[PDB]
């Protein structure tokens, strides 16, 4: 409910300001970059004395702090598991207030009563699902009740709760600056809001969704997915695998460098149906995939395997196919699929480049012959389309595909 909003930090015509009506002073110092297109984020780094600093000084209010909520979008790169301690958003003055910091895989909200007494709650990201760092946009919501609980949500899901110690002096200043605690990282923020009440589960999820274009598909880091751009296409079940080729088949190989994404072939997404005013990829767009291998441009498309892999299964491969083959055998309908853990998409086989769905793109290990195979079948982990009878796979995580920018 926006009637409780008492701070609203936003980029408006390339100027950070408070749009809430309470007109807090916003000062910008040093290397702060503002994004002129959505989501209109500001960017800070950790290097230099000219490091980047946003000071928000609230105006005449702090008379409304028995319950409050803090909400914002944030992205950190490269947020590695051994990250040193950093304060990033600080509102502490004379040893009381609150603070937001990061260390290792933790983001920590600290409610500071005195120099001696101090409570914190945190979100610790799942390292097993983020081998290359948690470098994706996420939505933080912190709700505090001075006579109740102190909670943190991430992407609208509750993570950590603590009872507040019942007896605090709040600072009028909020300072966005990446300050190390006695290699270089970047930080993006947008839509930093403070509410003068304790938001509940329902309001937080309404808020969460209201700040996104739900039908704009996202890349792995949460930025808008785009046509005519090189990506690494990776399946959620097999994040430790890169795309390769054998014969006319696409095969997935195990990564040598698991702490980043720089292996295998790159795909470019090509629009067939969609909005031409921009380059963004949207749900119900129909599209196809190109990839460049040994300087020859191929396109992804179905092919007949050496043997039947299973009922209703057809493998997806890299073929030198003319546009009419792409239409019949390699056109897809994309739908966004965002989870707490990842920004992904589902891909349905298009009937002749229409929005009519014939199957779903999944993945699996199958034993058959590719390339120069002759005498024996071999196990290959391949992208595979389940035709017609794919109802059980709709909820399956094997149909969740992500796209990591390959610059
Ligand atoms: C049937 C069964 O329970 N088998 C057990 C194994 O289950 C498979 O485990 C492998 C891991 O080695 C995979 O996780 C596989 O899951 C998927 C997958 O590959 O991601 C889900 C996909 O939906 C499915 N694809 C399609 C198109 O349906 C594939 C696919 O069926 C296979 O890849 C084809 O070979 O499978 C699990 O099914 C696993 O628990 C092992 C561990 O011991 O135990 C087997 O008993």
Author numbering: 864 to 923, 927 to 1033, 1036 to 1050, 1060 to 1284
Source paper text:
Botulinum neurotoxins (BoNTs) are a family of bacterial toxins produced by diverse strains of anaerobic clostridial bacteria. BoNTs are classified into seven major serotypes (BoNT/A–G). They are produced as ~150 kDa proteins, composed of a ~50 kDa light chain (LC) and a ~100 kDa heavy chain (HC). The HC contains two functional domains: the translocation domain on the N-terminal half (HN) and the receptor-binding domain on the C-terminal half (HC). BoNTs target neurons with exquisite specificity, which is achieved by recognizing two receptors in a “double-receptor” model.
The LC and HN of BoNT/DC are almost identical to the corresponding regions in BoNT/D, while its HC is most similar to BoNT/C1-HC. To identify the potential moiety on gangliosides recognized by BoNT/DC, we sought to determine the X-ray co-crystal structure of BoNT/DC-HC in complex with Sialyl-T. Co-crystallization of BoNT/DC-HC with Sialyl-T yielded crystals diffracting to 2.6 Å, with space group P41212. The complex contains two molecules per asymmetric unit (ASU), with well-defined electron density for Sialyl-T. Due to crystal contacts, Sialyl-T bound to chain A in the crystal is highly ordered, whereas the other Sialyl-T bound to chain B has much weaker electron density in the parts of Sialyl-T not interacting with BoNT/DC-HC. No significant differences were observed in the interactions between Sialyl-T and BoNT/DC-HC between the two Sialyl-T molecules, so from here on all data we report are based on the well-defined Sialyl-T molecule bound to chain A. The structure revealed that Sialyl-T binds to BoNT/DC-HC with a total of seven hydrogen bonds, all originating from the terminal sialic acid. There are two hydrogen bonds to S1242, one each to N1114, Y1115, I1240, and S1275. An additional hydrogen bond is formed with Y1243 via a bridging water molecule. The location of the Sialyl-T binding site in BoNT/DC is homologous to the well-defined GBS site in other BoNTs. The major difference is that this site in BoNT/DC forms contacts with only the sialic acid, but not the Gal-GalNAc, whereas the conserved GBS site in other BoNTs interacts with all three moieties. Essentially, the GBS in BoNT/DC has “degenerated” into a sialic acid-binding site.
